[PDB]
Write a protein that holds these residues in place. Sequence first.
Motif, PDB file in Angstrom:
ATOM      1  N   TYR A 224       0.850  -1.183   0.000  1.00  0.00           N
ATOM      2  CA  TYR A 224       0.000   0.000   0.000  1.00  0.00           C
ATOM      3  C   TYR A 224       0.886   1.234   0.000  1.00  0.00           C
ATOM      4  N   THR A 225       0.694   2.101  -0.990  1.00  0.00           N
ATOM      5  CA  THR A 225       1.469   3.326  -1.101  1.00  0.00           C
ATOM      6  C   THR A 225       0.521   4.504  -1.261  1.00  0.00           C
TER       7      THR A 225
ATOM      8  N   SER B 257       5.090   8.642  -2.039  1.00  0.00           N
ATOM      9  CA  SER B 257       5.906   7.789  -2.885  1.00  0.00           C
ATOM     10  C   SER B 257       6.929   8.608  -3.668  1.00  0.00           C
TER      11      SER B 257
ATOM     12  N   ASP C  20      -2.891   4.849  -3.349  1.00  0.00           N
ATOM     13  CA  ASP C  20      -3.899   5.809  -2.933  1.00  0.00           C
ATOM     14  C   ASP C  20      -3.437   7.225  -3.252  1.00  0.00           C
TER      15      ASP C  20
END
Lengths: 376, 670, 298, 566
Positions: free
Chosen positions: D400-401, D406, D442
């Motif tokens: 999950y990023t 990021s 996300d």
Amino acid sequence: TELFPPNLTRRYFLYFKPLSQNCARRYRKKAISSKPLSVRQIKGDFLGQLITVRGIITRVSDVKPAVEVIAYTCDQCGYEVFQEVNSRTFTPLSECTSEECSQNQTKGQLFMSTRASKFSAFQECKIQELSQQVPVGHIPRSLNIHVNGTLVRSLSPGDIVDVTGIFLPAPYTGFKALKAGLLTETYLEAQFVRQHKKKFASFSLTSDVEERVMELITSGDVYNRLAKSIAPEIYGNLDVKKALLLLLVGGVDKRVGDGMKIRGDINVCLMGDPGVAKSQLLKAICKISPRGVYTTGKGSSGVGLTAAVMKDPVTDEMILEGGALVLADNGICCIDEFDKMDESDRTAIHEVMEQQTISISKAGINTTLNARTSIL
Amino acid sequence: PLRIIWGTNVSIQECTTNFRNFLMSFKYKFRKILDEREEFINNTTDEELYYIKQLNEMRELGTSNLNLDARNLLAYKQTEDLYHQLLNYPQEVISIMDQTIKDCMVSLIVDNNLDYDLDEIETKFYKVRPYNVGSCKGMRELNPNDIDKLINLKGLVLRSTPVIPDMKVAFFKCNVCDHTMAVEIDRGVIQEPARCERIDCNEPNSMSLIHNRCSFADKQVIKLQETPDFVPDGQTPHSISLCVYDELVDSCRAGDRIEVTGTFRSIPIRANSRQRVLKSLYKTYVDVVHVKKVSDKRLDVDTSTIEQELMQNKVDHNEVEEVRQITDQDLAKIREVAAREDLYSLLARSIAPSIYELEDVKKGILLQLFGGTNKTFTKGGRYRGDINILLCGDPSTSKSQILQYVHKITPRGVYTSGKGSSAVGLTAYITRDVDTKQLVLESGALVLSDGGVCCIDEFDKMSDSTRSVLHEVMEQQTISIAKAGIITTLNARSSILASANPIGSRYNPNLPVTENIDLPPPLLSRFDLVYLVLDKVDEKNDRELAKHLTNLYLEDKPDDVLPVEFLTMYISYAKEHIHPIITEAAKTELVRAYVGMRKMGDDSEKRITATTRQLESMIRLAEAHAKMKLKNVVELEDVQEAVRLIRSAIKDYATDPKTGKIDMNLVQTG
Amino acid sequence: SFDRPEIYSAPVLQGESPNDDDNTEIIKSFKNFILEFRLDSQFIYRDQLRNNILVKNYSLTVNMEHLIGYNEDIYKKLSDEPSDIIPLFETAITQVAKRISILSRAQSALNSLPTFQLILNSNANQIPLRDLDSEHVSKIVRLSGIIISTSVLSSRATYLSIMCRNCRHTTSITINNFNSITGNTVSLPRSCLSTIESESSMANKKNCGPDPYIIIHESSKFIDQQFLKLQEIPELVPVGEMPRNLTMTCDRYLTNKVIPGTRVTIVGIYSIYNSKSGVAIRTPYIKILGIQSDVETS
Amino acid sequence: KKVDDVTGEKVREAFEQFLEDFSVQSTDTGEVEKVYRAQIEFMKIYDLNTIYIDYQHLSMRENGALAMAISEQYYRFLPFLQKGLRRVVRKYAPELLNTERVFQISFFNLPTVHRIRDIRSEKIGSLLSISGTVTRTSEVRPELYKASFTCDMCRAIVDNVEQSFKYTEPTFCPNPSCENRAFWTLNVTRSRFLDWQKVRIQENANEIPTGSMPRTLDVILRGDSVERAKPGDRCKFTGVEIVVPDVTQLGLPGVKPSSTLDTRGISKTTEGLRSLGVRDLTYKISFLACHVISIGSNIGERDQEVFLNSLSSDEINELKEMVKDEHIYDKLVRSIAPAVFGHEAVKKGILLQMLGGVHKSTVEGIKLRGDINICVVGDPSTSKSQFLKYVVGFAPRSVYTSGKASSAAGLTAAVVRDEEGGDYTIEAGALMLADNGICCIDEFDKMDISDQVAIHEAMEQQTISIAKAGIHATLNARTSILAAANPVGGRYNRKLSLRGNLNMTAPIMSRFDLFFVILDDCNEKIDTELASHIVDLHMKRDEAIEPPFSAEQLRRYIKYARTFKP
Ligand SMILES: Nc1ncnc2c1ncn2[C@@H]1O[C@H](COP(=O)(O)OP(=O)(O)OP(O)(O)=S)[C@@H](O)[C@H]1O
Ligand SMILES: Nc1ncnc2c1ncn2[C@@H]1O[C@H](COP(=O)(O)OP(=O)(O)OP(O)(O)=S)[C@@H](O)[C@H]1O
Ligand SMILES: Nc1ncnc2c1ncn2[C@@H]1O[C@H](COP(=O)(O)OP(=O)(O)OP(O)(O)=S)[C@@H](O)[C@H]1O
Ligand SMILES: [Mg+2]
Ligand SMILES: [Mg+2]
Ligand SMILES: [Mg+2]
Ligand SMILES: [Zn+2]
Ligand SMILES: [Zn+2]
Ligand SMILES: [Zn+2]
Ligand SMILES: [Zn+2]
């Protein structure tokens, strides 16, 4: 018998205050030590002499313990061995050198003790040539000042000072290929400091101050006399100069028992048509105040206002170095061309003007820092 | 005559006798009369033997650490010199004190003929931890003559190294005859045996050190950002290295504010790795003796964030307290104050006495301090009762003072400003360590403020990229980093308190609420409470406010409000011990209120429509209100109070639902 | 352009307990023997040392059987390994003599005082020359014979001031040991000592070369060394055998005290040298510690 | 003669007695079978070098003294364990000894597993269990186990000299030719080597304290344990806490221990013509794992015949029961994300994303992507992040990023400078950690445009190219993408198209198979049941969730279904 030498039993530091020009005038004495030199005029023939240099302090290192003589204890013989240190680096003594172990076939092992060894409080400072001292079309030059003993913390960045000290050579730093002969670095071992502008916190009710204060009071009309004499080459603007004097004085700093703070510093804006000599008024105030820093709208950037994380090599650590607002801490920050500033500097002064702090949360740093400036 | 340790004025026998007499004869009434507190003297706390009681309880729990207040030494007459000796010579005086504690330990069980075995006490090593050794002087104001002295530092922990093995016993084995010896370290030096000590084997250079057989001790280096009381002209904050040893390793986490007392040490640093040449300029650091993580002025840390840390504290036997101890009398006072009918108004009024009125804002701030209940799913989900508040207002509304108060009151929050912060500086970054020249990981402002409140001033001025960081913090209470250094999920359980201005720097009644706030709906939906703090000019309001500000300057040092210590401990007890649950009557009227405000949002942006996060915020605020009154259930009136606070915060009664405009005169009451 | 750092010490703590085999304790015991020994009613060695300083004779003559009467252990140490113990007793004589060389000339109204020479006489059993053995190597032997040749006086260096050839580093070497024969047990250093010392802060790759030091003769000090040859007495020699002899070395006040033809008793160290007949064979010789003339020619 | 360790001798006898004498009763029949003789005779068939010993079985012996002695002083007692195992193998299976075979004992099932921050200095040299996330793994390398040297002037060969961590040279030299001990040379061909791998592990996300950054640890795998650790998974390592020399600690505050050679029994002379050597004692804690087991990265092999053999018959019955159901699709689409109320189309798309499609290649060499990419766009608070949080929690090999948090190197792969040393390394980015899995991104709109470029390079090419500095590499990026995006202006504009609402690049938009636009419409009834569901979740915790299938059986069915190639 072997004694502790007098170097190990001295509790005092000795400094040479330069002879004054006025006292030298009385006896027809011509004082090389009194005359303030610029950084450019300190040449190699002044080495070893007691000389005075006037200039602005740019950088001050943190106070660090510089060891002058190292003390070792030997368990074998019970002696304390002391080795002097006069360089930036030393090799520690390993194996014992007292007279008892020297004759014996079994030499003791030395263990260094910090409390028995002798340290000096050490600071390294940079003094810069003043703008009137710099010749035409030249860049100001700098000089290293070594501060030892009691004189530490008497120099702060931004102070215009007379530093009197002994001009001494140092071992050469630089590339070996570039050096020709017995090249040496230079530094000034500080002996005395005189402030061109006296700090407000350093003020004390000495006897000589009292009669001048009483004379100024008994002359009467002190408020208008001080206000009209702020920038007397500027005609008129009496109410502006009155508010500028109130800017210099300020109100009392308010502390609530809850910890909430209300600032005592006054902030003054002077907005008007061009040619009303308000830049002259800012320069007048900002030479008058002991910690006045003059800035330009775009000449002073954001990092030049708040702070920057930089390495100090003499103490060998990364420290926060302040901008213009930190330089004017408990002083006046003198912002000319106020409407020309970008929005980041406006946010910085927006936090400064009420909370008197700068909160920086970047990749470099996560701090709040005190910026107690009164802003003109 | 009198035997004195060389370089000191310390006599071992005199110090042992004085400290033993202090242990046997000290009463806290001596501390009270030292501090000029005569009216606060009571019988049952003072006239009992204080250190005898702590020694008895220390035997009963089996602990080995005694916390010594050095101010108590100055209270006692015979140990007035011992206080100065402890400050000046901690290395010898602390060892003497440990020996005296062990002697009193054996004497208490021999004298009273207790059933405790002497052998178990004798094998234990007792050590004392002095604290409150003096004023927190600036670390950069210390001189080289202050080396090896006891000092106090207030600070913020930025980061800590991993646990470092420091060799204490060295294990040597002979290569030819497998003969082993163990040599104990002496002042940082281990002497390698040149030859085998056995009579049979005498081979030179045959003893090899075995690195895994030999014993080690824990050593940790922590970077502390000093926050001194007094700051000279133009000083920037600096970070100092502090070394903790043995049980104190890993006691301090990044982002917490601590009181460190320890000895001021200096060492020479090798100029090169291959060379033994040392640098003449010494490096200064603090060898930590005692850490205090509890302040009476501020709240304590939320224990739900440190449950595993509390377990590891019990395992390590460090005996450092993260939470303040609650006595029976003050707990009875807490229970009596919770029974007051004006408890909500009393607690909100005692938040910021210097700030006048702002009653609903103070109520929201108090509920944010209490927080909602934290629910952790057994499957793996997590719900946090963290309340986010936005204060959008006109200038001169004390909202900066409110964020300042909250920053002072929280245990480990961070205060930041708009455009003084970046996206990288809020989450995490990579720096180069000065000591090791290594790339080290350091937490940003949001991670440092985890378990507390992150206050953001000038929130409207913050850039879109920087505000877009706050989405995951506000909704999941975490940050999911995928960078070159780290790919991980970091907990950021920080309640966000933001302060903001309108676009024109003043509220314009011509424009609607959404335009005046000027926030994107994804960001503004994540705020539990949005306060429109408005300046309405009235005769009585301006008169009262002007009088309130002018009463401050009557004296140099300035209804009934609770003291900050009692306020902090009451909120601490409620957060620790009250976990309210929603009931059926609360559930049905929560649903009815959410449906009603969704129906209000049907009318024709101009208005902030109701959203599911507003239902979540109603749940969190109702849980906070139930936790305030020490009730273990959330019932209907708490939910109505949550709904009322939500309506009154944005002034929904004042605004016209159709236009979205706010009229100053026709409803508003300042 | 800074000066040398200075290393110095001062006694503070008691330290470890003294050991009998330590050099300082042996020197102290020798000093106590010099100061406190009584023959009949007088301190003979103390008064002898004072008189020798008055005559400017920088040596002490000590009877070895007096060391029996005073202290056995240091006598055993002197007999078993004289090469290490004799410098300690010479240091003790020089240390006592400094107290006499200050407290006398300043009261009965610069001066440099050298290391005193130990001359020691024995009345014990005299080993015959042909009964010398490998068990006597590096030990004090008392032996008798006739001296057949005395060589000319050679000049050995005690103190010499040396200077580097190009570096111009100045050093001094002090020699108190002259016992060695056909060997330079102390010589000029093989490389300049300025670099390893690092005395100056500037330290202005520079290599001075092998053997860069030059002796400054006008500031160097010297003593006299003499070679003697001792033969067994011709009255007791086997009929078919050539009489056997030994080369001996004396220095300072022991030189020129005997002429060839004199029958002498000699206390000395049976010592070793290699002369460049067996893979590992050393020629014996005697380092003379004392000469006693049995009869005096007129 | 050498002196022995009497406690080590007792440990050896007790352990070799344990290797035979221990027995358990059979579950099916009740026969008394002795598991470790069966283990040794099983290794004698397949030439295995590794014996696996349960720690509980060793703990049952005596009163527990043998297990405590082995765990406390594992480094000391390990050669005695080796000798006991060699003697026990010699008594029963002498053929294992011949090829000398290096034996490794792997312990597992320790009663407690320790956190990476619970590592302390008192546990150095002790058997212990840790858990952590593998972030970097190294090439399998040879380590000098039993070296062979030749003396430089003797020039005779010697062999089988033991190496104790850092490189050692012998000083014995039993050849009578020399009188010099120190001078040797080493030949690499005749030397004996062992397999060696260094894998870097990190603190797990739930194990991290309140404000601290994650800290790493380098654990060494040897022998058969090598390559059982993969980047991006959670592994439990059982092994010995060792200590490794570290020159990094030179500038640290505090007194660093040094090591001088003691000179008290050396006779010296001042004949003339004073140098001595001192070594630093600075160390860092490392781990040497004998056993590696890979825990699931989730909270709770392509051939189906391989997969069904792992399952027991009772669970295969449950799997075939789920297959037999005619309404299996309805159960699956309702079992996806039970916390989310409604949104059946998104649950269908997420289920199909987890199942995926087949990867096909033409005769030209063009590869057809079987991964299905989903993008969810819509109004705020439409449970878009709930889907991603469910997927990263449930699906294996899923990361999950966030878009803002990021980076381009953090998403694909990064070249890393380590300790300012001349070597460079590669650490896998988010898409590599989610290879043959789902990468959940996300706040896709908030990500920088250069990061979008760096990711769609992998989106067309299914690979990541590295040309930075001296490292050139092609890495696999066969990952599905589940993205959550917000439209420009916050709300989704009905008047505009999909490209008008999305700030994402058109090459980003073309690779997404499904775009799910979830709109917020205020209706009384739907809001009523949605509010009731959410408050019931907050009220009832786990038992407000009623999926047709539990997470374990859903994961088992998905793992079974991925084997089919339609
Ligand atoms: N009242 C005054 N008294 C004396 N000199 C004045 C007065 N007003 C203007 N001047 C002079 O006119 C010039 C104006 O210079 P500035 O100080 O730059 O004025 P200004 O207000 O800063 O205009 P700017 O910079 O364009 S906004 C200077 O040479 C002043 O000395
Ligand atoms: N309602 C109030 N109660 C008490 N003091 C007040 C009140 N309003 C203003 N003040 C005082 O006026 C000062 C103005 O500062 P703040 O109100 O904190 O500024 P602000 O509300 O943050 O608005 P900004 O800075 O333009 S965003 C405060 O520090 C108080 O001393
Ligand atoms: N259909 C739904 N079923 C269950 N919970 C929901 C639903 N819609 C919203 N929620 C809840 O409302 C909140 C919205 O959180 P998110 O999933 O982060 O919203 P979102 O759809 O991601 O919108 P953004 O882009 O984050 S503003 C969470 O607490 C959800 O549990
Ligand atoms: Mg101007
Ligand atoms: Mg403000
Ligand atoms: Mg979201
Ligand atoms: Zn000594
Ligand atoms: Zn041995
Ligand atoms: Zn030279
Ligand atoms: Zn050999």
